[PDB]
């Protein structure tokens, strides 16, 4: 379509043509024209094959999860609650002009519960959600029981090397490594029926209940709100911050000051991105809460069908390598066939349960995914004497020193498979928080041989991709990337639990399974995507401060100077999943390129595939790590930008770039201080290009051996002080800002100089001198928008001697009728061409058809949406012609 579509509000999208006004009547309503009532919104937006698809929540939406019978997951009936998520199909009903018209809707039902599922359900636990105010020392846990601790007890030290055969620890060298961290103090943990509290601890270590919700409710939670009152009054915040605004501003739902309980926010979450192709409609959750099923809807689904999700839990990845898998899946809990009520997600067969996704897109008839593995780990809820009681049970994997330098080799690496390894070690004089070696070394859950049937492990989720949040040296390693070898190249190990980034490319048969898992009656049905591939994505270590190498830093100690919006500087993030179509060609024979681009903390990362068989990039040596995959760092003009507000993300086939929308006034109201924000006024944008030596160039690039890239340049269009409406992205060389200065709304033209966008006064009064019009005014005497035409004088014909030539010669001459005018470009390479009209038979008329900013030639018929434009382009009378030859 010639238009662009601009979410208004949250219930209004309005069509804008390319010279940034909008079409007369198409403001739209999209949440009546759905027939949903106000409390809904729309919360995402695409357009498949001419038509609109828009995804919508409600405010209003409440889920209960009840532990006892079936169907454990469901809407609350009483009063309004009973409001589901619905995707919903607009087609364009007229032909001048904008009506849109509801033609298909699709209700998004609650996830189907299995007895499987809900022995995990019952003691399922998740940690408050990460926001914009949350510190590294909010997130810091109170350190677990050692290898020793928990094995052999409280007894004496020197049995370790004598007692640890019969355990199953040989040769294993940490007895004092970490078995997890306590879950009696920091962050709240709470069940799917409980509400996540408005406070969170400064110093996690000492404040909050963690999962003691009892604790909390009768002590603790009245100690928070009278060092952190909400505002009106005036708090001291020593030990707690007051994120109540923050939490509003990522979704969260309240009753009042109540948060709603944590299915509700999983599921109000679960339903924020969307994705269409010819078959189905996919919908996933937002990356500020991790999410643990996605819908994937028939469009041949009948009118008032409840569709349902598929869970994650059920939906096997390809993490690159089996043991990658291994790695998660053992970390996720305790499993023996010999245990009592002891039901976590890997006792019950099931896969990783969550993710903090980034987003999702469509590109052909292929769904692209990304996100972060949202850390999942057991945790000892028994009750009496445990040695681990109350504590989550998590462990760094971060590769050994010894390991051999080669992709698979890191990630394949045994260190830390089954149990904890790493913590403390120094050799001669060198100290390092990994182990230097990997009959063998072996690893071991951290539950003790005796308290095997007596033992509860249950499963718990964190609100960000770190397992292991005990307060010791090795978990800032492992969360910053500064675990490396000694050896001569000096290569990053990698952890295989902690900041885990997930991706793939998923095929209309791999949808089709993930439908009928869902649909599944008893048992879990399994669903298995092969063209999925993990990542090891730290946070960039330079986003901290005063970190000692050569007294350890931990979270609790570790300083914060990250400039992208986050207190913290240990939690990756991501945002603006988006696909794109490479405009450059291939070479004949081949199929031509796509790729995805993403946002996180610190740099893009740009996803690769192969077009021949829709699959993800790949070469065939091993030691280099998976080309479908590469991560370019930002510099400071990018790090800078608040990745808290992201607005929107759109791709342009024509220049083959992503424009990422940031909004200032998505900002919560107040501080984990109850301050008022007061930089919330202006906005961002960043412009991501595609680097490297792209597939199927030349027969040279048939195989590649190196992955191609992206660049992410903070463009140069910004503001701290307008409100934005919306960025037309209408050329390489140009882009449109509406925006309000005032209450009313203002075209400004920002001109690509080189790479870098600087804002062209003269073009943007050019522009927005329209008059009411829709678009910009022509004057004769002016070099405008259009630039200037100066027609020859009639006397032009005889002293040429073109009046020799009929009307019909010279109307079927281009190169004669350029000769009737001068033109003068407002931008360079602009074009203007005259189109000739015969008069008579002894003269003709000729009007200018002219490029706009767009690259778009535009004349006297000219419509957008149907409806004249009506420019005011001249017309220019040459008679004197011969009447035959
Ligand atoms: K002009």
Same mark, same amino acid.
């Given at each position: ?9 949250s219930?209004?999208?309005?069509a ?7 079409? *007369?009547?198409?403001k ?18 695409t357009?498949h ?22 169907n ?20 364009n ?11 298909k809707?699709?209700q998004?039902?609650?996830?189907? !519960? ?7 359900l ?41 007692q640890r055969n019969?355990? @199953?620890?040989?040769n294993?060298?940490s007895?004092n490594?970490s ?5 009696t ?15 969170? /601890?400064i ?8 999962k %003691? ?10 100690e928070?709100?009278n %060092?952190?009152?909400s ?11 007051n ?11 309240f009753?009042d000051?109540?948060?709603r ?7 109000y979450? $679960?339903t ?14 937002? $990356?500020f ?13 009948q009118?008032n ?18 043991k990658q ?16 009520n ?10 990783? /349960? ?6 999702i ?10 996100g972060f593995?949202?850390? &999942?780990?057991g945790? %000892? ?8 009681? @109350?504590?989550?049970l ?23 498979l089954?149990?904890?390894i ?6 001669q ?6 182990? /230097? ?12 041989k005796?308290?095997?049937?007596t ?16 307060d010791?040296?090795i978990?800032?390693? %492992? ?6 070898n ?5 290569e990053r ?7 885990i980034?997930?991706?793939?490319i998923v ?6 399974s993930a439908?009928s ?33 050569? $007294? ?7 300083? $914060? ?12 993030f ?6 794109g ?5 291939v ?16 740099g ?11 699959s993800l990039?790949?070469?065939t040596?091993?030691?280099i790590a ?10 400071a003009?990018?790090?800078? !930008? ?14 083959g770039?992503?424009?990422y929308?940031?909004?200032? &006034?998505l900002?919560?109201?107040?501080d984990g ?7 919330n ?10 680097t490297?030596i ?5 027969q ?10 992206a ?11 307008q409100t934005?409406?919306?960025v ?13 200065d ?27 001198t329209?008059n ?8 004769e ?24 030539? *009929? ?21 360079? @390479?602009?074009?203007?061409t005259?189109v000739?009209?015969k008069?008579?038979?002894?003269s ?6 002219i ?7 535009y004349d006297?018929?000219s *419509? ?7 420019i ?14």
């Open positions: 379509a010639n238009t662009f579509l601009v979410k208004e509000d219930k209004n999208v309005t804008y043509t390319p010279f940034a006004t909008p079409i *007369t009547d198409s739209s309503d999209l949440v009546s024209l759905a027939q949903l009532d106000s409390s809904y919104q729309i919360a995402d937006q357009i094959n001419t038509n609109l698809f828009v995804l919508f929540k409600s405010r209003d939406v409440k889920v209960k999860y009840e532990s006892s019978g079936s454990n997951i469901s809407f609350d009936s009483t009063s309004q609650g009973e409001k589901p998520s619905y995707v919903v199909e607009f087609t009903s007229t032909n001048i002009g904008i009506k849109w018209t509801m033609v809707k699709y998004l039902d609650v996830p189907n !519960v299995s007895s499987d599922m809900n022995q995990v019952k003691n399922l636990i998740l940690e408050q959600p990460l926001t914009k105010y949350t510190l590294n020392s909010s997130l810091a846990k109170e350190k677990g029981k050692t290898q020793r601790e928990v094995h052999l007890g409280s007894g004496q030290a020197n049995q370790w090397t004598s019969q355990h @199953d620890l040989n294993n060298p007895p490594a078995t997890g961290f306590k879950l103090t920091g962050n709240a943990y709470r069940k799917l029926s409980e509400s996540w509290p408005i406070y969170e /601890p110093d996690g270590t000492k404040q909050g209940k963690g %003691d919700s009892s604790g909390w409710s009768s002590t603790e939670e009245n928070a709100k %060092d952190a009152p505002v009106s009054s005036s708090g001291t915040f020593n030990k707690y911050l994120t109540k605004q923050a939490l509003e501003s990522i979704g969260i739902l009753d000051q109540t948060p309980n944590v299915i509700t926010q999983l599921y979450a $679960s924020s991105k969307l994705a269409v192709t010819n078959n189905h409609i996919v919908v996933m959750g937002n $990356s809460l991790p999410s643990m099923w996605y819908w994937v809807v028939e469009r041949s689904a009118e069908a409840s569709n349902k999700p598929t869970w994650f839990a059920n939906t096997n990845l390809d993490w690159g390598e089996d898998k291994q790695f998660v899946e053992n970390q996720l809990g305790y499993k023996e066939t010999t245990s009592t002891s039901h976590n997600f890997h006792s019950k067969s099931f896969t990783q /349960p969550a993710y903090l996704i980034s987003g897109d469509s590109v052909n008839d292929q769904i692209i995914f990304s593995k949202a850390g &999942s780990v945790y %000892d809820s028994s009750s009496s004497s445990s040695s681990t009681k @109350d504590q989550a998590a462990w760094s994997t971060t590769t050994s020193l010894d390991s051999k330098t080669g992709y698979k080799d890191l990630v394949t690496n045994d260190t830390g089954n149990g904890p790493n913590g403390s070690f120094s050799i004089d060198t100290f390092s928080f990994v182990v /230097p070696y990997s009959g063998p070394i072996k690893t071991a859950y951290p539950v003790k005796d308290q095997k049937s033992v509860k492990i249950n499963s718990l989720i964190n609100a960000t991709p770190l397992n292991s949040y005990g010791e040296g978990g800032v390693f %492992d969360a910053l990337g500064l675990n490396y000694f050896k001569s190249n000096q190990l990698p952890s295989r639990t902690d900041q980034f997930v991706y793939g095929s209309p048969n791999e949808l089709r439908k898992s869902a649909d599944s009656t008893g048992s879990d049905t399994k669903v298995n995507w092969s063209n999925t591939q993990s990542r090891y994505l730290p946070v960039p270590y330079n986003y901290s401060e005063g970190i000692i190498d050569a $007294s350890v830093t931990t979270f609790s100690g570790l300083k $914060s100077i990250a400039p992208d919006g986050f207190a913290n500087s240990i939690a990756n991501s945002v603006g999943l988006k696909a179509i490479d405009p450059n060609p070479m004949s024979g081949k199929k031509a390129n796509y790729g995805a681009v993403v946002l996180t903390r610190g893009v990362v740009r996803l690769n595939f192969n077009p021949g068989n829709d990039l790949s070469t040596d091993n030691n998976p080309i479908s995959f590469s991560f370019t760092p930002f510099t003009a990018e790090s800078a !930008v608040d990745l808290t507000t992201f607005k929107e993300v759109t791709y342009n086939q024509e220049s770039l992503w424009s929308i940031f909004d200032s &006034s900002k919560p109201s107040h201080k109850q301050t008022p924000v007061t930089d006024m202006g906005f961002s944008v960043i412009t991501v290009s595609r490297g792209e597939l199927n160039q030349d040279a690039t048939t195989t590649l051996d190196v992955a191609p890239s660049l992410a340049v903070q463009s140069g269009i910004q503001s701290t002080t934005l409406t919306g037309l992205p209408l050329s390489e060389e140009f882009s449109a800002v509406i925006a309000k005032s209450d009313q709304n203002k075209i400004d033209i920002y001109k690509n100089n080189n790479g870098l966008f600087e804002i062209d006064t003269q073009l943007s009064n050019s522009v927005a329209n009411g019009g829709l678009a910009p005014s022509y004057t005497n002016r070099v405008d928008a259009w630039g200037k035409v100066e027609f020859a004088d009639n006397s032009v014909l005889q002293a040429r001697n073109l009046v020799d030539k *009929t009307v019909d010669e010279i109307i079927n001459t281009p190169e004669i009728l350029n000769s009737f005018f001068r033109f003068t470009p407002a931008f360079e @390479d602009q074009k203007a005259l000739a009209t008069q008579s038979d002894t003709l008329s000729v009007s200018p058809r490029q706009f900013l767009d690259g778009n030639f006297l018929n *419509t957008i949406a149907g409806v004249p434009l009506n005011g382009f001249p017309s220019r009378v040459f008679a004197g012609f011969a009447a035959l030859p």
